[PDB]
Design a protein around this ligand. Structure first.
Ligand SMILES: *[C@@]12=NC3=[C]C([C])=C([C])[C]=C3N([C][C]([O])[C]([O])[C]([O])[C]OP([O])([O])=O)C1=NC(=O)[N]C2=O
Length: 107
């Protein structure tokens, strides 16, 4: 059971431009509150800053990255999100999109 989102890297702050049906149902947010925004709205108090940094650097360096983050639903309840971000480049080597597979690993 996984969800899938696409982030536009041609825009500076990598806003989300497509999310799967499961992503909305897992987090409780609608497309009116997800599209056009950065995925960081899912984070909160217990989210490890050290893990968030691993993603920030991989995006700035144009690499892939797999982290385990604590995220929060719209109702504020926490869940554990195994996140894997993958860069998508053009033939000139420039990153156009970042793609993400999110898995709820709360078991
Ligand atoms: C988020 N999923 C997600 C999916 C993709 C494709 C990308 C590129 C990032 C995420 N994030 C991270 C978020 O967008 C942001 O990059 C990070 O917060 C680190 O950058 P900053 O500048 O904020 O330090 C995801 N973050 C989540 O918490 N949950 C996901 O599903």
């Amino acid at each position: 059971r996984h969800t899938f989102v696409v982030a536009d890297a041609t825009l500076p702050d990598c806003p989300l431009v497509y999310a799967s049906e499961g992503f909305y149902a897992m987090t409780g947010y609608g497309p009116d509150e997800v599209l056009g925004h950065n995925c960081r709205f899912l984070q909160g108090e217990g989210t490890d800053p050290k893990e968030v940094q691993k993603i920030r650097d991989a995006i700035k360096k144009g690499e892939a990255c797999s982290v385990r983050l604590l995220n929060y639903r719209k109702d504020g309840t926490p869940f554990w999100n195994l996140l894997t971000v993958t860069p998508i480049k053009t033939p000139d080597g420039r990153v156009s999109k970042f793609v993400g597979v999110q898995v709820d690993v709360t078991s």
